[PDB]
């Protein structure tokens, strides 16, 4: 997979901003946000994968993600716990 | 609570009368002529 | 496999609280996650206290003071009252 | 109001006067000049 | 005459006790240390005359709120306060001293009202109707009277005449703030900040019992911009709808949200199993 | 200008449904996961949880950005507001 | 009253909580009233949450509680939201706030 | 005893924080914030002390109360 | 000679980012701590190290808060920190709701 | 009562021969060691309980180190730990 | 001693006893304490190296808390690791 960050379309970021209460959005935001999101996911996934590899498994399960989030103080209800 | 809330409906009814009363007073206190430099007072 | 969850207990509590209300499956998943999370928090804090005080037993005092630390004012007061009432009546019975 | 600027061997003073548009904090009831659409105003004078 | 009285604002930096005298058309405060520090107040210029007894406070007060401001020393003031502090078997002697001073000051305030030939009513605050708030920089007990909302203990003094109020606005109702708008739009609005939310329903009732309209809002408004717009054209302001922020009817077509259609299809297990006898080894 | 935006804000605040498309997000997640271990498998609930967490995080970040932009007496959010928000949060 | 829940007038399982406290590696020993106290607290808290969730579902004319109503109940209660300020709820949405 | 935190002390703390100009209400705002912080921390410490069945507040109670908040402190026996 | 408002300010900033000594007088802080503690349980005793740790933590917290406040103030294109800056920083941190 | 002061001093003289340490800094270093120990042991315990194991081995310690420390630091620490474990295991 | 066998200076017996008495697991393998001691020794060596550098930079031959604070807040990886800890008498970095 090569450069799939542009799958976070501009209307999607606009919708996320509207849910956040933003009325007028600068054009550099979309790229800013994209980078931020990348850095987030890379930090969460690196831990989820670390759990998956430690269980000597080959599939990333929902509990791996839940523990990775819980480690950052990002506890998630609804998917187990 | 029904009695207290009916006294609160009277409280709201009074508040509605008061807003309508002040609206009528304001329109009587300020005339279109007063807005346009009423009683002379043309930037003395 | 028999998986354990608090779903039936949440149904019981709900019918006790709201006889004419129902819960979705996802809301039950959230409630189960919440119950597990609170249990983990309280047990971990109780263990931390026991180790702080060089003790090897978790008694109702450790749980009470854990509730005092975790919950805010009114929540702590009511939950402490409820727990002491239940423990007193279980002891009496 | 006015301003003062030092420039080489000379000192400059700019004096600004009341003119409509560039008005003061005074209310609409009392103007520092007489009302007049056809009146022209000395807005500023600069001396050295 | 009333002896051993302090005046606020003080005519000289040094706080000195004086004597208050009743005359034919007003009152005179006169310091014993300097004849030149006289304060003369005409009955015609007093708007409100308050008596505040020493019951839970350490001082008894005689407050004159003025129609026109007076120059006392270097300060322009609408308010002139006359007071004495009681802060001195001991508990009984203190109670006797408080009661004696309250009787002396009350009688003297009645004698001021009598000397005015019915121009001045003596007002006493209703302590039981008092609420805590921040009109300036300190939390203070605001006390209603017959005709005014007052705070006289701490400087600066608050004196709000109820008849001069056009509308009250309750901000941050979602502690709240109370804003008084006056009938004279040139007069700045008065804020009473940080009122406990427990007093909200009491304040709403009290404003209704006094015939003051009120409105509530989640946000603090920029009254300094609003009052300038209203001053620019007061007629256009009332033409549109005036206060009670009515707006242009339906701002945006109502889209609703609740549809009374239960979703999230879930089996009603109710008394289900999936647990039975959860292993309960009674070790301890 | 500014009314359809508020209407959309209201609409989207009334709802819970995920805003990022599901398959582009799946591809992004796989692309990012392709660095830490080659040829990984993912549960569907894992991707769903990741999307929920990501959208919650971004909404909170947009809340803080809106607060900063309002603080600057503006209405438009700019990248320096995001940077200030991430700095104050303690984000690297 | 055979079950320990009945002897304490509870609905949560005392026995399971006891087993989890023991087979959980928390301390060498466990009391006899710690499981009872913890079950009482947990039941009280769940009742507290379900009351407000039922209120919110009844304000939306709905018979079933969904994650939206749990989100509303948590984010609308001062104490619960303080307790659960660092918790994300799946399908919970946001609070109307303009 | 909250007026013991004088204006110069708040100025000193702002200067070590790099602040160049200070409003006049900053002092009261800072006193309120400090009071809230200290209230929470001392409440946790006193909870620890009561649990330990003591009448004296030790340094261990403060250190554990700060670890509880996430404000881990080094150099006091932790 | 006459200093322009802000030169002594920068001198003090340089002086206080160099030193590590506690900037609050000890007795006022002890009295404040005892006043606060007296509202939870009467006749409480404090080890001097407890007061020292509390003072260190409180000053570290306040300095971090003042740094965030300064960042907010500079963001608004100003130089004077204001109560609204503090409230915004505490809200963004997640301390005030 | 036990501490790490002598070991910290030995390590200091191993890295910096002509440098001393104050008592307050030795206290801070002891607190730091205890903190890092507690973090690593808690992570190892959580991992063991996730994986349903009764034993804390070197695999749990290694993966907790990987979870906790940043990239280069974690890499160097894992290198050191593996080196020490192999040197200890090779002899007896 | 088990520290000598692994070529270490930190104690293996003490760490094993602390892991044993800390209620962490039913049993503790023998390769965990060696690995953990090695990690702790590496981290303290790094900390003391940078703190000694910082103390020489100030021309001092003894490490005080100020040098520990400077070493921590000046190293990106350590400052990310010790992101929430406050050091008594550590001060702040000079930053205008």
UniProtKB/Swiss-Prot annotation, chain A:
Tell me the function of this protein.
Core component of nucleosome. Nucleosomes wrap and compact DNA into chromatin, limiting DNA accessibility to the cellular machineries which require DNA as a template. Histones thereby play a central role in transcription regulation, DNA repair, DNA replication and chromosomal stability. DNA accessibility is regulated via a complex set of post-translational modifications of histones, also called histone code, and nucleosome remodeling.
Source species: Homo sapiens
| Modified residue annotations for Phosphoserine | 26
Give the consequence of mutating residue 11 to R. Answer: In TEBIVANED3; results in early developmental defects when expressed in zebrafish embryos
Q: Does the keyword Transmembrane helix apply?
A: no
- Listed name of the protein: Histone H4
Which keywords label this protein?
Acetylation, Chromosomal rearrangement, Chromosome, Citrullination, Disease variant, DNA-binding, Hydroxylation, Intellectual disability, Isopeptide bond, Methylation, Nucleosome core, Nucleus, Phosphoprotein, Ubl conjugation
Consequence when changing residue 70 to R: In TEBIVANED1; results in severe early developmental defects when expressed in zebrafish embryos; results in defective cell cycle progression when expressed in zebrafish embryos
Cite the location of the cross-link Glycyl lysine isopeptide (Lys-Gly) (interchain with G-Cter in SUMO2) from the record: 10, 38, 58, 70
Q: Where is the signal peptide?
A: none
The outcome of changing residue 10 to R is: Abolished ufmylation
UniProtKB/Swiss-Prot annotation, chain F:
Q: Which residues carry this modification: N6-acetyllysine?
A: 14, 37, 73, 80
**PTM sites of type N6-(2-hydroxyisobutyryl)lysine:** 14, 22, 37, 80
**Modified residues annotated as N6,N6-dimethyllysine in this record:** 37
| Phosphothreonine: modified positions | 38, 65
Consequence of changing residue 78 to I:
In BRYLIB1; decreased protein abundance
N6,N6,N6-trimethyllysine, modified sites:
14, 37
> Which controlled-vocabulary keywords does the entry list?
Acetylation, ADP-ribosylation, Chromosome, Citrullination, Disease variant, DNA-binding, Hydroxylation, Intellectual disability, Lipoprotein, Methylation, Nucleosome core, Nucleus, Phosphoprotein, Ubl conjugation
Q: How is it modified after translation?
A: Acetylation is generally linked to gene activation. Acetylation at Lys-80 (H3K122ac) by EP300/p300 plays a central role in chromatin structure: localizes at the surface of the histone octamer and stimulates transcription, possibly by promoting nucleosome instability. H3R2me2a is present at the 3' of genes regardless of their transcription state and is enriched on inactive promoters, while it is absent on active promoters.
Superkingdom of the source species:
Eukaryota
Q: Does the keyword Ubl conjugation apply?
A: yes
What does altering residue 19 to R do? In BRYLIB1; uncertain significance
For the modification Phosphoserine, the affected residues are 15, 44
Q: Which residues carry this modification: N6-lactoyllysine?
A: 14, 37
On this chain, the residues bearing N6-methyllysine are 14, 22, 37, 80
Task: Kindly list the positions at which N6-crotonyllysine occurs in this protein.
Answer: 14
N6-succinyllysine-modified residues are 14, 37, 80
Q: What is the effect of changing residue 75 to L?
A: In BRYLIB1; uncertain significance
So what family is this one in? Answer: Belongs to the histone H3 family.
Using the UniProt entry, name the condition the protein is associated with: Glioma: Gliomas are benign or malignant central nervous system neoplasms derived from glial cells. They comprise astrocytomas and glioblastoma multiforme that are derived from astrocytes, oligodendrogliomas derived from oligodendrocytes and ependymomas derived from ependymocytes.
Q: Identify this protein by name.
A: Histone H3.3
Q: Which organism is it from?
A: Homo sapiens (Human)
State which gene encodes it.
H3-3A
Swiss-Prot record, chain G:
Disulfide linkage: none
Reproduce the UniProt comment on modification after translation.
Answer: It is involved in the initiation of both imprinted and random X inactivation. Ubiquitinated H2A is enriched in inactive X chromosome chromatin. Ubiquitination of H2A functions downstream of methylation of 'Lys-27' of histone H3 (H3K27me). H2AK119Ub by RNF2/RING2 can also be induced by ultraviolet and may be involved in DNA repair.
Does the record's keyword annotation contain 4Fe-4S? no
Establish whether keyword Phosphoprotein is in the entry: yes
- Using the UniProt entry, state the residues involved in the cross-link Glycyl lysine isopeptide (Lys-Gly) (interchain with G-Cter in ubiquitin), renumbered to this chain: 2
Q: Give all N6-crotonyllysine modified positions.
A: 23
Give an example GO molecular function. Answer: DNA binding
Keywords from UniProt, A to Z, are: Acetylation, Chromosome, Citrullination, DNA-binding, Hydroxylation, Isopeptide bond, Methylation, Nucleosome core, Nucleus, Phosphoprotein, Ubl conjugation
Localization of this protein: Nucleus; Chromosome
User: To which protein family does this belong?
Assistant: Belongs to the histone H2A family.
N6-succinyllysine-modified residues are 82
- Look up the domain of life of the source: Eukaryota
User: Which residues are annotated as modified residue N6-(2-hydroxyisobutyryl)lysine in the UniProt record?
Assistant: 23, 61-62, 82
Span of the entire protein shown here: 15 to 112 of 130
The GO biological-process annotations, alphabetized, read as: chromatin organization; heterochromatin formation; negative regulation of cell population proliferation; protein localization to CENP-A containing chromatin
Q: Which GO terms describe its cellular component?
A: CENP-A containing nucleosome; extracellular exosome; nucleosome; nucleus
What protein does this entry describe?
Histone H2A type 1-B/E
How this chain assembles, per its entry, is: The nucleosome is a histone octamer containing two molecules each of H2A, H2B, H3 and H4 assembled in one H3-H4 heterotetramer and two H2A-H2B heterodimers. The octamer wraps approximately 147 bp of DNA.
Q: Which residues carry this modification: N6-glutaryllysine?
A: 82
Where is the PTM N6-(beta-hydroxybutyryl)lysine found along the chain?
Answer: 23, 82
N5-methylglutamine occurs at: 91
Curated annotation (Swiss-Prot), chain J:
N6-malonyllysine modified-residue sites: 83
Q: Which residues carry this modification: N6-acetyllysine?
A: 52
GO molecular function annotations of the record: DNA binding; lipopolysaccharide binding; protein heterodimerization activity; structural constituent of chromatin
GO CC, sorted alphabetically, is: CENP-A containing nucleosome; cytosol; extracellular space; nucleoplasm; nucleosome; nucleus
Residues with the modification N6-methyllysine, per the entry, are: 13, 75
Location of this chain's protein in the cell: Nucleus; Chromosome
Glycosylated residues, per the record, are: 79
Which positions carry N6,N6-dimethyllysine? 24
Q: Which residues carry this modification: PolyADP-ribosyl glutamic acid?
A: 2
Where are residues bearing N6-lactoyllysine located in the sequence?
10, 52, 75, 83, 87
Q: Which residues carry this modification: N6-(beta-hydroxybutyryl)lysine?
A: 1, 52, 83, 87
Which residues are recorded with the post-translational modification Dimethylated arginine? 46
Q: Which residues carry this modification: Phosphoserine?
A: 3
Q: Where is this cross-link: Glycyl lysine isopeptide (Lys-Gly) (interchain with G-Cter in ubiquitin)?
A: 1, 87
| Residue numbers of N6-methylated lysine PTMs | 83
Where are the N6-(2-hydroxyisobutyryl)lysine residues found in this chain? Answer: 1, 10, 13, 24, 52, 75, 83, 87
Q: In this chain, where does the modification N6-crotonyllysine occur?
A: 1
Residues bearing the modification N6-glutaryllysine: 1, 10, 13, 75, 83, 87
Summarizing the function annotation, the protein's role is: Core component of nucleosome. Nucleosomes wrap and compact DNA into chromatin, limiting DNA accessibility to the cellular machineries which require DNA as a template. Histones thereby play a central role in transcription regulation, DNA repair, DNA replication and chromosomal stability. DNA accessibility is regulated via a complex set of post-translational modifications of histones, also called histone code, and nucleosome remodeling. Has broad antibacterial activity. May contribute to the formation of the functional antimicrobial barrier of the colonic epithelium, and to the bactericidal activity of amniotic fluid.
Under the subunit heading, UniProt states: The nucleosome is a histone octamer containing two molecules each of H2A, H2B, H3 and H4 assembled in one H3-H4 heterotetramer and two H2A-H2B heterodimers. The octamer wraps approximately 147 bp of DNA. Heterodimer H2BC11 and H2AZ1 interacts with VPS72 (via N-terminal domain).
Organism in which the protein naturally occurs: Homo sapiens
